[PDB]
Amino acid sequence: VYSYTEKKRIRKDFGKRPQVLDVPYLLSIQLDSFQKFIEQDPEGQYGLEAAFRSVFPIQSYSGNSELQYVSYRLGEPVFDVQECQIRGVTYSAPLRVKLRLVIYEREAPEGTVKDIKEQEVYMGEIPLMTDNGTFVINGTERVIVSQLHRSPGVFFDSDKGKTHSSGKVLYNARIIPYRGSWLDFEFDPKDNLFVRIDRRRKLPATIILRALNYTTEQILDLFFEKVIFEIRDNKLQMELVPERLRGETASFDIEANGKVYVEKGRRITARHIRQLEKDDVKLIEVPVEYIAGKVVAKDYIDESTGELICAANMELSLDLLAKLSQSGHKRIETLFTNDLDHGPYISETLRVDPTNDRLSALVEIYRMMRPGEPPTREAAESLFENLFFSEDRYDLSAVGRMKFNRSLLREEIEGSGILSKDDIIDVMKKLIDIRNGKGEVDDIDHLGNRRIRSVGEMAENQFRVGLVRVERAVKERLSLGDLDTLMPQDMINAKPISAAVKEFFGSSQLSQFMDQNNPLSEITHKRRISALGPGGLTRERAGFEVRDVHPTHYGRVCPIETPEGPNIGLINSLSVYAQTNEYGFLETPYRKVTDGVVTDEIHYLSAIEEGNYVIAQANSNLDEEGHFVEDLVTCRSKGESSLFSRDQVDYMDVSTQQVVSVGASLIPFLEHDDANRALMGANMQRQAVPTLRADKPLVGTGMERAVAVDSGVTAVAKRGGVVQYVDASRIVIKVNEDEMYPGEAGIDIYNLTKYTRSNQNTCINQMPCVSLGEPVERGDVLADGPSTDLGELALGQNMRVAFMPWNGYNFEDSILVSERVVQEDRFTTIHIQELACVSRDTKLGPEEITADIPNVGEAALSKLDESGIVYIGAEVTGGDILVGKVTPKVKDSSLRVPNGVSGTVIDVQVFTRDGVEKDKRALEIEEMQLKQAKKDLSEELQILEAGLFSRIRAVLVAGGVEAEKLDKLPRDRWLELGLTDEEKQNQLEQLAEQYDELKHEFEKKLEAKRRKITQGDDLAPGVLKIVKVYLAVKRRIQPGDKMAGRHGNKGVISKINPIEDMPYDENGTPVDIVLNPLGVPSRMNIGQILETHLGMAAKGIGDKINAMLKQQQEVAKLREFIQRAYDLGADVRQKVDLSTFSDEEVMRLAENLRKGMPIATPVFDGAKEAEIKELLKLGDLPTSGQIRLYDGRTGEQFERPVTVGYMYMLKLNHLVDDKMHARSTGSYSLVTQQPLGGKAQFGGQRFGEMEVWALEAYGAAYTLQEMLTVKSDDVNGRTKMYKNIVDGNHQMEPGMPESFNVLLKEIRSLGINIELEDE
Amino acid sequence: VPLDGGRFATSDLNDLYRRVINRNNRLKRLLDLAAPDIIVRNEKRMLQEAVDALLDNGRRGRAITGSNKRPLKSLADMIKGKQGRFRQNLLGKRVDYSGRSVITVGPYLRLHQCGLPKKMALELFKPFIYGKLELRGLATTIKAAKKMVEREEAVVWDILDEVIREHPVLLNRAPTLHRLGIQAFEPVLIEGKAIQLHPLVCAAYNADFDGDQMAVHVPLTLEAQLEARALMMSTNNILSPANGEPIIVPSQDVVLGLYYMTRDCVNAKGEGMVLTGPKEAERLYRSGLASLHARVKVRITEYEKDANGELVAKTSLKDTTVGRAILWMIVPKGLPYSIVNQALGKKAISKMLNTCYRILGLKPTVIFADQIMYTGFAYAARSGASVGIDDMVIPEKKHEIISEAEAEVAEIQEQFQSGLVTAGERYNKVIDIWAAANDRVSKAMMDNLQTETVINRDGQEEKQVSFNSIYMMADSGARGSAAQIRQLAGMRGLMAKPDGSIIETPITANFREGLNVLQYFISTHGARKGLADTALKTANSGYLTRRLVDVAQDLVVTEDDCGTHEGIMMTPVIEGGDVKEPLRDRVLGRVTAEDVLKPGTADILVPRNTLLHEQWCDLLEENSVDAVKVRSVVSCDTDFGVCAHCYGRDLAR
RNA sequence: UCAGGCGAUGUUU
DNA sequence: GCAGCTAGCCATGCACATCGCCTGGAATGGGT
DNA sequence: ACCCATTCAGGCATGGCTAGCTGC
Ligand SMILES: [Mg+2]
Ligand SMILES: [Zn+2]
């Protein structure tokens, strides 16, 4: 089976693996995100609902007047997308909110005084998302790029090594909350624990412990274990957990009820510990003159006097032992302390404490957070209770709580959104546990600690900032307010909401100016995953590890598609099958494996989940029965690959593509290329530029169809049906029956978009690709777009290439091209510039747009109408006058085509602020656009009304027909009919009433449309009317353009030979490009050769069919041959039963193949050499793939075969007439009399610091003294130089550089004094 | 400035001055009414800190915000930093009379001249044009002639040629690392819009043709023209001041050419016929009787300059190959014929050029370089050396070798599974055995390439070096090396992992056959490591060069002989392993300090103020003395400079 | 005609 | 119970050219 | 109301320094 358009040119498909999960819709990120941001959803949970329900209700300072939320609504936009782009306003939507204001009975219980509900207070506008995923801000078309940052959570890092050189490692532990203040714990090389907050300074961690109202005894209890001593007969016998000794070598006897196990000195063996635990003998005597080297648990004041005996956490000594045994504290508790397992860390830090109580602690914290102030007690109380415990200024999310509890082995996943004593303590415990020698630091690349936001997250957050900025003012007015003499819509002022959300969608390190020169460029730029922006690292701090590719990127983030240069590794593209988990971790598909069967059950997995299971790999020969045909297979387990048993696997890859992005899965034979060149290939492909005459790629990879359709640059049909009227402007489809709505539905109408500007000045354009009277299925192309063809992606063109060094003209990489190319116009691009001409009424007067001009006569003014603006069509050049603008004196402020830029004017826009006249050509274009709007919208409704007459006269026809009673009268006799008084007469009467209503509706609709098109929308303050002109250059190809393959072989075209001189082959065809073979071995991209050979096979099949069809052959031969070509190949999934097409439907297929039978090559399951050979031999070409070529000059065989074939090349857009530039003398700058910089401004180069070093290196000094004096700075000398030059004398006069004179004046402006001495 | 319309872009200066002046007026006010002291103290403090702002914002705690959100620029910032005057408008500045464009190839140029676009030129030399015009009287004044050039009438182009004729320009490439990145040329006018640049200089500029750009500057004054003609034109830099090794080293296409041009097969058309001179060798190769490389005898005549400057001829029958003679028709007079007899790889052709230099001077070397290039390109193209899949040959033993290695792996795996070895030596054992297999396969492929061709001699069989296009491009030294031809044919070895550890399963497959996915995906971070490294490398190295030039700046060779008897000592470097640098090349061209006594004492071998060039080094080798004292710039004893003799040869002369 | 953002470019050995 | 040392706090800097494209002073409050 | 009066967070290396800091 095939979708009826594929039956046109059915692409042949090598490839062996069955595909189970088709390519998904390539814009899920953008579309789901925003659809989620803006959609009525109950129970909070990620929407404007969440935002509001969080910030509201707003209550006065107990004044019992309160404001609360109800619902909200979104009116339809005041325009549509296309009109919106054309005019310039955003593509916005109004925001209505139902609010409720209540007041309780003053001086009483909660007696509701009054509740007025202002219907839908208006609080601003938020843009929408076009069905392509692009916002429209000011006439242009922008995109928001998803950001990648650190999972709000907790982390345990090492920072091994590099610090303190001591060989010792640290262990810091951080808490990064979603919104608020950070928190860090860290050690110091003396094992001293320290908290810090917001990166300010250091503090002794126990300070914040004690700040959380803990007494030292509580602290020691909570962290350390215990050790029990009794003042018995003597020597104060001790309790001993046997294990507690294994790390500590003993220095006294070790017995049990006399039964000695070890005598003084040695370590302990686990056999001994087992014996002892078997024995239970613990209450044992100890050498008393030893324990003095320990630490006390609590405070043992006197039983009787309670004197200041001992402070907790203090050393010991037998004098103190007696000082306490005076009253005989028969129970002493100490802290178990190992120096390998369990260390005294907190004890030592507690000693280093400056403070001793809660209040002093709070004081210290307040003083570090705010330098220089006497702390008020409860003020500091507020400061602390407001950083880590208040719903307001600190918030993890669900995300934070999940990742947190996960890191702490807690039970649940839900919980509060603020910290707690439990939490901080548990973090400290875990940190200590690490320093002890269990558990492991995480790392900060593993994609379980790194997360994807999107447009939804962003806009939601920024809007929240809006609401808090409004609640402060609302709360204020409400506190200082009065009794309900003001309705809600006067409390709230939307201007902050609007301004903030505009700030975001208009000026961000994210919202950027969408690349648009190319379908693939759009669909890459929307899937981009950047690591920059607020809340993220920046291009001067990123080290090396974030830039490297960690082994969990596999299948979630591309390895190869990425810019090169400054920001490598931060602009990760996003894989094909990738999806966003519920919380926001990148997760990928996999196939569930039961005991021995590879199911077809997909199943998604995140990063960390993948760690435990064992995963197969894409290309593992399984046979027909869900069984791996071998019994041990390559697999990957925990960031590690190996070979495993047949029975251990659990999950298998989905397809073979899933490791790359749609940036670089259009690269046939990718797996025969080094990573480097695949990379540069992906990029250059992204920078193609639409040609003039698109053309399928002879050697593609089965993803073209997806990228094209599922981008937004082609006209896809919405309801299957039949074409009724085609045209380069519109397409009109008659819907089928069943897919049609019941009520007076009608037909469909697509407005193809004819020539218009793209954000890169290239052209954008659409063409019909179906002929009159023809079926179309749902979800199908009806108009090729820029760089598309019959619905496939086509960036460049396929030309006949031959690899051989040819007389130097292809020295390094310089492609050499034959004039056949430029003649046939198969690289002739199309560009468009957009000039501008505005008019502000100023002080000293207004400005009209007349055509009255001094210094030039009709010889120049001709091309203008008598109204002033240029005619549509005149071939203008550099210096002509596009608009006549005059300024009150009169001074000329006209508008001219800048130098160089040729043109051919195609369109003129005129905006005008409502309240001004419309001069002559304004009126002309005005009534023209009225006629346009009429014959467009009205005429649309006219064909619609025709079809509608058909439907309702069929209401008069189909069934109880009035054939003779109805054919005579025109189609107007339907309202008052008296016929079969059943449902047909009921329908007649009521629907005809409805229809006179519809006549009125027609009228009101058209009138509304005229009204719109008449209103003159807003502008910049102080401006009257804006005239815009467009131009359309047309660029051929010429020594200097940069052409490029898809495999990363660049090259600057370097000469244009005549047809005579190409290398021709024995049958006469020249060869159209000549590359340079030396470029293959080094840059180890052996791929482009395989591309070439398979290409030649393709064109072989082509020429064969071409002959068979030119001889006007019968059809049997064609079915046979086509069938054979689709059938060869080892064992492929392609299977076309060509014998089930209509005889006509084949002749059409040959017609579209005669240029060359396209071929697939799914990326990592390509075609093999064996099949390439067999395909060639199906053709009639030599197996090796090399021909002999003669030589256009001497006509004598090159001395050994060469490689000719077809290859797909692209015209990158660094066009040479955009680069080239020159300058003799012109505009000088203003503060430092140097020349300007750039091309538009007619500037000059930058003789920079490194060049000056060079010149100094040569002995040359006059060249340098010149290029620092006469060419640039000395005013006086500059002019005098020019004068001498024209007189014929060459000589300079140094003088002194004005820029230095400026330096003098500035330093002198400081207090300093700088002179020039005398000689 | 009046921006578009009526508004005025606020300048940080204007702003800050305005603020301090308001503050000051208020403070004068409050001292006209004897207001209270708290108020006057507040006012004074505000004023002090506002002046602090004006002078150096950002230095006193927190900067004052700008008009929008971001600190605004004060005087100190207007001086210092990457964008103050000293680094933005004094050290290096913008420049009239210049232009920029894309570069391309043009292999028809003598190496002292470069293409140049027409349009771009007529826009550069507008002044000199106006001159020559009103000199010939074809006009009246400036403005008339300006109309002339605007029109581009039929005369202007002729006069443009007339003023181009001899007038050097400077070409420059953007990141000028070192002196050779600004050179001179004479212009030849061309259509199109791309600067055409001779090919033997791409090496020096480090300029591939993948879309780089070059700037052109014009010299105006007369001293400056003489400059570009005496110090900067490409025919006066054929030695790099780094190390006196040539810089016109021919490059990829041209060496593939000469190579295929001079290399014996065993049996092609025209065997053993004897020829009367390079001339008729060429005449054969054209009419197609003999083949470009066929063992043959010829009569050649070479000149040797044994006399005190006189050239003596001698002839003889050498044994050679047709193509090799046809090369010989170029070589200038006095060089032994044994210079072009061998295979002519890259190293060898460089050796040829350099000996030609040392013996015959300069002009012969320049002209001989240009002829190398022409004949090279010509016979390369005439060869047609392509590359195709069939020419990367798999060793037929690779499968066997790698299976055997796999088995040994499994054996170690068992010896561990039964618990007889530690994971440590297990790891090490496996990695070593894979390395061994790697080397075995590499041997295999290199063998089967280099000897591949086996053919018959009018006898039975015989083996010779091959003609396998990829082997050829790798044996000439044009591109690649053993390493990369390995990575095309045989396995591509072990690939590192991000940290520095090394993964224990090599990429069993090469680039001709495919790569299954996981293999490719390892190779990725293998490569991205370095590719991402290179950028930060660039930045940091730039910084290094900057600081270096700003400490070694003042130092100009001022006097002529400090006349001192200090100095340092020189011995060749020995690092436990073999000697690394010979004493010869550490002492080439550097003025001695004390007469070097022959090991037989009282046998003074060299004076103390000599200039040790090649022949004196030979004498040193003869008596084999191997510890020589010598004068070094660190010891010279001259004020404010460095004396000539203490600095030695000037490499590049 | 003055300051930020972004992207690209090139500097791949 | 002073002095050499050692430890935290701030200053400094971090390639070169392009080219684009945009984006850009209000902020209250006032007088007719 | 309109255009103008007075005002508003992933460095690292080093170094250079300041304030304790425990030999004497
Ligand atoms: Mg380059
Ligand atoms: Zn000296």
UniProtKB/Swiss-Prot annotation, chain A:
It comes from the Bacteria. The modification N6-acetyllysine is found at residues 999, 1177. It catalyses: RNA(n) + a ribonucleoside 5'-triphosphate = RNA(n+1) + diphosphate. GO terms for biological process: bacterial-type flagellum assembly; bacterial-type flagellum-dependent cell motility; cell motility; cellular response to cell envelope stress; DNA-templated transcription initiation; intracellular iron ion homeostasis; nitrate assimilation; regulation of DNA-templated transcription elongation. Co-administration of salinamide and rifampicin or salinamide and myxopyronin suppresses the emergence of resistance to both antibiotics. GO terms for cellular component: cytoplasm; cytosol; cytosolic DNA-directed RNA polymerase complex; membrane; transcription elongation factor complex. This is DNA-directed RNA polymerase subunit beta. The lineage of its organism: Bacteria, Pseudomonadati, Pseudomonadota, Gammaproteobacteria, Enterobacterales. The gene is rpoB.
Swiss-Prot record, chain B:
Belongs to the RNA polymerase beta' chain family. Changing residue 252 to P: Resistant to antibiotics salinamide A and B. The RNAP catalytic core consists of 2 alpha, 1 beta, 1 beta' and 1 omega subunit. When a sigma factor is associated with the core the holoenzyme is formed, which can initiate transcription. The rRNA transcription and antitermination complex (rrnTAC) consists of RNAP, NusA, NusB, NusE (rpsJ), NusG, SubB, ribosomal protein S4, DNA and precursor rRNA; S4 is more flexible than other subunits. Acetylated on several lysine residues in the presence of glucose. This is DNA-directed RNA polymerase subunit beta'. Co-administration of salinamide and rifampicin or salinamide and myxopyronin suppresses the emergence of resistance to both antibiotics. Zn(2+) 2 binds at residues 562, 636, 643, 646. Changing residue 486 to C/H/P/S: Resistant to antibiotics salinamide A and B. Mg(2+) binds at residues 208, 210, 212. DNA-dependent RNA polymerase (RNAP) catalyzes the transcription of DNA into RNA using the four ribonucleoside triphosphates as substrates. Resistance to the antibiotics salinamide A, salinamide B, rifampicin, streptolydigin, CBR703, myxopyronin, and lipiarmycin can result from mutations in this protein.
